[PDB]
Amino acid sequence: GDNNQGADGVGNASGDWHCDSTWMGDRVVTKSTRTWVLPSYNNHQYREIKSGSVDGSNANAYFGYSTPWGYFDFNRFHSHWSPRDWQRLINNYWGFRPRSLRVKIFNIQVKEVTVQDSTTTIANNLTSTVQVFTDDDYQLPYVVGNGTEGCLPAFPPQVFTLPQYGYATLNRDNTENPTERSSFFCLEYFPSKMLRTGNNFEFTYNFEEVPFHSSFAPSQNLFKLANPLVDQYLYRFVSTNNTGGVQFNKNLAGRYANTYKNWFPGPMGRTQGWNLGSGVNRASVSAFATTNRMELEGASYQVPPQPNGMTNNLQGSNTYALENTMIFNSQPANPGTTATYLEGNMLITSESETQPVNRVAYNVGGQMATNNQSSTTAPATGTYNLQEIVPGSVWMERDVYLQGPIWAKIPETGAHFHPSPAMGGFGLKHPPPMMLIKNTPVPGNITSFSDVPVSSFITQYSTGQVTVEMEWELKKENSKRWNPEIQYTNNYNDPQFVDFAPDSTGEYRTTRPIGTRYLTRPL
C-alpha cells in the first residue's frame, strides 16, 4: 500500500516517518527512519587508490578504486533496535532470525553551494537529480558486511553522512602494482533509478532460511552430562602391576574426570591472555610481534576475531584473551585517529557464558601421547596449543551484541565449511542487496567545445530520509526451570547520568555492551 499522493512534485512529502517497533505473537517488525547527507565524492570521478607497505607490514599493501558512489549500510543491530526492544528480545526469547526487509528513500533535497569571496552560500536547486540502484545480482564487490563504519546511527535524531564505496582488488607480489586479474567495476554500467526532488525509491527483499540464533547459555557442563548418582558400566585402564600387565577399575559415581564422553568441545587456537582490571601484565610489550597471524599469499595477516569455538574470558576472572575478543568504543571517534585508548574507554566483550561448551582461548587444549612405551621407556605426553574440527564436536557460536553486525556474505568460491561469521551474526549466501546512491554531475559554465571531458562541475550535495523495516522471527522460551533466571537489568550504583540516553551536551551515551545470552537452557 503506502499510497496517499495528491500530486508528485515539490510541495508534497514523499513519505511519512515511521520509527516504531511492533511485537506481534512471536515475530516482531522493527521500523527505523534516519536522515542522511551525501557529499560529492572525488568531484564526480573514479580514481585508483593504492598503498605500499605501511608500518613495516607488507600485508597492508592493496590496489583498488574509490568511486563517487555512497552506499547505505544499515548493518548493525542497534540501527533497528532500541535498548528497551533489545532488552525484551534477549530476556524472554531463546532465538531470533530475520525474515523480510523493505527499504525506502524519500524526501530527496539537492543543495547547491557557491563560494564568491568566501561567502559560501547554500541554495537548493529543484531540477537536479540523484541516482539510486540496489545491486541484487551480487556482481559487485560486497563491502557491507565486514564491520566498517557508516551504519545508521544508534539514536534516531542523529544525522549521518554516507560512506564512500571503494574496493581492494588483486595486487602483484605484495606491492601496490596491479595484475592481469585485477578487475575494474564501473558502477554506472548498471541500470539505476534517477530521482528528482519529488520522487521516492523503495525496495523489498526476503531472506533465505537460516538457523535461529541462540540466545541461551547452557545450564550444564559438556563433560558433566552424566548423572552423579549411578556409576557407569564401563571400565577404565588405571595402572599396571609389577609384571607387565594391565589393571582396570570401574567408572564410579559422580567422578567426571574419568568417564566415557560422547561429545567433545569445539576447535581452538591458543591466544594470549591479558589481565584487565587489577592488572599485573608484563610491561612495555608491543603486541604486533606475538599476535596470532594466518599467512595468506605470502604475507602475515592478523585475524583479531578468532574462529568460533572458544571463550576469551573465564567466568568473572579478570584475564581476557584480547586477540579473541570484540572491542568497541563507548562513543564514535574521528576518522583516522591514532590516539591510544586505555581500557576504561572501551566496551570489551566477554564470552564467559559459553564456557561450559567452549574451551578457553588462553589455556592449552589438552595433551596426547608422544611415545610408544616398552619395558625400557616410560609413557610420555605433551600439550597441544591448537586443535580443529573433530567428529562429534559441539561448540557455541559467537554472540551478537547491540553494537555488532547483523550478517555477512559467504565468499563465492568452490567450498566452505560451516558458514558462520567469526565476528558474529548470520552468514548469508545472498545478503540484502547493496544500495548505492550518487549525485549526478551538473557541469559549470563551459563556453567552447573540447573533446577532453568536462572537469568543471557545480559543487552540490543532497539529503533526505531513509527507512528500513525488517521482520524478525522469534522462538519462545519453553523452559521449566524452577528458580529465577538472570535478566538484563538497568542497575547502576550511584548514577551521574542515565545510560543509553543523551548527555547535557546532546551526546548519546553507551556505557556497556549488551549480549543475547541470559536465558539458561539444560544443554
Place this chain on the structure above:
Amino acid sequence: GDNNQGADGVGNASGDWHCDSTWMGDRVVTKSTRTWVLPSYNNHQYREIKSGSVDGSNANAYFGYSTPWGYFDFNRFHSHWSPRDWQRLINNYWGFRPRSLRVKIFNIQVKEVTVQDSTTTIANNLTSTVQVFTDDDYQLPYVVGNGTEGCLPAFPPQVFTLPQYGYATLNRDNTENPTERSSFFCLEYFPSKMLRTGNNFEFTYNFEEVPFHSSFAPSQNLFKLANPLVDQYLYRFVSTNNTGGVQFNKNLAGRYANTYKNWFPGPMGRTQGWNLGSGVNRASVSAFATTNRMELEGASYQVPPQPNGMTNNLQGSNTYALENTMIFNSQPANPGTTATYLEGNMLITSESETQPVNRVAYNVGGQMATNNQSSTTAPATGTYNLQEIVPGSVWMERDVYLQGPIWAKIPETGAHFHPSPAMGGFGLKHPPPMMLIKNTPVPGNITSFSDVPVSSFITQYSTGQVTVEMEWELKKENSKRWNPEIQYTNNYNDPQFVDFAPDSTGEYRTTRPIGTRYLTRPL
C-alpha cells in the same frame, strides 16, 4: 468533508480560516484558528537539563530532558470562546461539558535564515518538511494540563510561538542526579506524519463522558435547608441540673444554630487570610516560611491552589486567602521575570459565591470535645484547623474562568478519590492527545565522511495556521425564580477604554476575570 482541492502543492491554500462560533439548540460548536511560529529548538538536539536546590528549597531540584519538539497547547477557556460567547454561556445556562474535538494544521511555510556579515536575510525553501504527530496512547509525559504558558492567544490576530517540550523525571535524593528508574523518552521513536509546504494534517477526538460543570450558585445555606415555620420533632440536650442529670429541649421554629442536619460541608485545610484593598496586613512578611506545604519524597512542596471544598473570599469582604486562590496577570509578561507585582496589576479570583456550601478557608473548621467529663472535670473543647472527607459531605467544585485551564489528566496510578482538578476544569482519564511538531534538520555543507554525527545545520523555522474546533454540550436553565437574577454585565464607571479589546498601541486589554457562577439555584 472539507474537500476543495484543485491540486496539492505550492499555489494551493491548504485550508480556509474558520474562527466563528455556532449556537444550535443546547449544544455549541466553537471553531478557532490561529497563526503559529516554531523556532528551531536546541539546534535539533535532545539535551538533559537538571537543577539543584535554588532559593534554598530542595524541592526545586529536578532531572529531565529538553527536546526539540514544540507542542500545541490549546488548553485554556479563552482560546475557544470570545468574551461575548462566554457571556451568553454563563448567563442563561446551568452547565456545560465538551463532547468532540477536531484539529487541523495547514498552510505550512518553512523559512530559511542566513547571516553573511550580519545581513540575516530570510528566504523560504519549498522542499523542506515538518513532522507532526499526536500522541493518542498516552505513553509520553503529559505536560499539557498543568496550567503553563504557550496556549492559543486570547485575541485571534495575535501570532504565538510554540512552547518547547520537556519533562522532569525522577531524581536521586532531592539532588540533580538521576536514578535507575529515571526514564528517557525519545519522541522520534513514534510514527509521525511529515508535511511539506503543500500538505496539511488533521485529527479527531471524542471525549469521555464527564459530569456537567456547575454554572449555578446555590440559593440557600446548607445548614438552613429546613423551613423556618414549623419546628422539628427532635429534641436536643440543653443543660444539666443540680444533681447530675440531663435536661432536654425542643428544636423550635427557625432557630438554625441547633437543629438536626442531614448533610455536611466539604473538606478544609486552613489557609492564611490576607487583607486586600483597604489593607492593614502585617508589615514585612516573607510568606514562603508560613505557607501550607505538603511534604512528599522528603521535600516540602507548596500547593498554592488548595484542594476543593473551600472558599477564599467571604461575600464582598476584603480579606482573601491568597494560598487558596487563582491569580492571573492582566497582560502576558516576559518569560523568566522576577519583577514584584502589586495587587493592582493582578486578576484575583473570588470563590465567594460558593460560600453557602463551602467552609471559609481562613476560619477554623469547627470544634470537638477534648475530654470526658465527670463530677470532678468540666467539659472542654478545642478547634480543629483541618478536616477531610466525611460520609454525607457536599461541596462546590472550583469554578472555571475565561482565563483558566479546561481539563487535566488523572495521573495513572493504582487509585484516586474523586478526580477533579484543584485548579479547575474537567478531570479526564484520556485527555485530548498531545500534538507535537518539529522542523526536520537540513544539514549544511559537509565535504567529508565522519562517523561522528553531523553538527552543522541550516538554521530554519516554520509557520502556518492551526484550527481547533470543539463541540460543547449544555444544560438549559429550568429555574422558576420570580425576581431577576444576576447577569454578567459590561458596566464600567467612566471608561477610558473598552475592556476586552485593543488599546491604542494594539495591545489586547483584560481588566477583570469572568467566572461561570451567576445563575442561582435552590441548592
Place this chain on the structure above:
Amino acid sequence: GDNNQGADGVGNASGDWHCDSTWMGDRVVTKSTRTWVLPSYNNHQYREIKSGSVDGSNANAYFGYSTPWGYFDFNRFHSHWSPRDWQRLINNYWGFRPRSLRVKIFNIQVKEVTVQDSTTTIANNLTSTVQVFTDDDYQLPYVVGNGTEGCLPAFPPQVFTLPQYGYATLNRDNTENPTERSSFFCLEYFPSKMLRTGNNFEFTYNFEEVPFHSSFAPSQNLFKLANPLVDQYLYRFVSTNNTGGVQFNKNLAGRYANTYKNWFPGPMGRTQGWNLGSGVNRASVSAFATTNRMELEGASYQVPPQPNGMTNNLQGSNTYALENTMIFNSQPANPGTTATYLEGNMLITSESETQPVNRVAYNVGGQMATNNQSSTTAPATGTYNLQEIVPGSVWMERDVYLQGPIWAKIPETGAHFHPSPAMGGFGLKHPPPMMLIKNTPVPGNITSFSDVPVSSFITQYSTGQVTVEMEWELKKENSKRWNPEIQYTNNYNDPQFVDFAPDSTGEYRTTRPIGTRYLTRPL
C-alpha cells in the same frame, strides 16, 4: 471434560497430577497440585474456646468455637506461581487480575491408627468416608483471607496438614463471656458431599470484575508533572511591603516548590521510623507502648499494616517504618513460637518504588496555618501528623508479593470506602467459596444402649491430592521508554547455594521477597 474412568472404586486413580502453567496470549492459566493430610480434630467434637486478656491487653480477649472441620486455604501468591513464572509476570506486564478458578479433590485415602501396648500400627480402611462442602452463599464466618497459615506449600513435593476451622464471635465487655448476639454456626447443617476412597470432588468459580493490579512504578514525581522549560501564567503571593500590602511574583521555569498543583498525595498516618542495617536506633525500647493503635469497642488494637497511601522505606535509605511494613520469615516456623528473631532472618518489605505518588510514613504530612494575622500578630503554622482522603487524591496501592495473600473479603456492612485490602491483593465482595472437609466419625465398640451420645471413636486420618487451577488476565506493556528498564534478576554475589531451591537437607530456601513493581510508567 476430564473423563477417563474404567470403573469407579479402589484400583482406579481418581485424577491425574497437573502442576504446569500455560502462557497463552495475554492470559495465563496456572495449575497446581498438592498432597494434604487431615488430622482428626477435637476427637470429632465442637468446642467453645475463649480467652481473657493475655499480655496485659484486653483486646486479646475473644469468645469462639473450634470445629472439627479443616479447610483448604490456597490463598497466597506462591501457591499458584513458580519463581520463574512470577519473574516473567512482573518483568514484562503492567497488570494482572484473576478470572476463573476450578478446584478438584481426588485420591482420598482414609487410614486407621491403632495402639495396642504402644505399637501404633497404621492400616487403612476402604469403607470409611470424608465430607467435603464448599460454602458459596458466604453464610459462615470467612477466615480465609486474613493472612494466616495453612496455605498450599511453596514447593510442590511438600505435604501440608490442613488448618482447623474456628471463629471468634462477639464477647461481652472485653472479657471471655458471650453476649446475646454471639452466634453459633454448626457446619454440619449444610449439605455436604460424602466421598469414599474411590470418589472425587470438583468445583468451579468465576471471579467478579475487579481492577487490574498495577505492576508499574511511576516515572515522575507527582508534584513535578509540569515541564521545566516554560513558566506558568499563574502568580503567587510572595511577601508584603512596609505598609500592609501584598506583593506577587510569577511562577517561573522549573521551580517546583512553588507552582500550582492539580493533584495531591494520598492519606497518611504517621508511623515510627526504625533504622535497619547500619543501625543507631534507641536502646531497650518496648514497642507495644508507642505503636499506632486504633481503638474499637473500648479496647486498643494495633493495626500493623497501615492503610494504603504511604511508603515505609525511602529510596534505598536504611530507615524503615516497621509499623507500616509487611514482614515475612525466610522459612516456616513452629506453631506457637515465642522466639525472638533478629533482622537477618526476616524478609522485610520495602515500598520505596511508590515514593513519587506516596507520602513517607515516618515524616510529617505537611503544615497549615494556625492563626489569623493582623498588624499585631505574625503568621504562624504547625505540622500535622495525620491527614485523610481529599478531593483530588492519588495514591499507590500496596504491592503484592510472591509470599503475600491474593485476595480478601469485604466485610458485609452498610457501607465501605474504596475496598482494597491493607495487606494487599484484590478486595472482593464474593471471594472464592470456602472449602471445608472433615473425617466422618466411625464409632468404636459399644455393647449397650445409652442416650448420652457416643464418646468412643476409632482414631483415623485421611490424605490425598488437591488441584487448584486459576485463570489470570494480563495487561501488556505498551511503554515507549528508550533506555533499559529494571528487571528482576537472579544476581547473588558468591553464592553458597541457589536461592528458591532445596538445601542439602531437603529444605526449600527463600532468601528475599519478590514484588511486582519493576516496569516504569510516566505517571
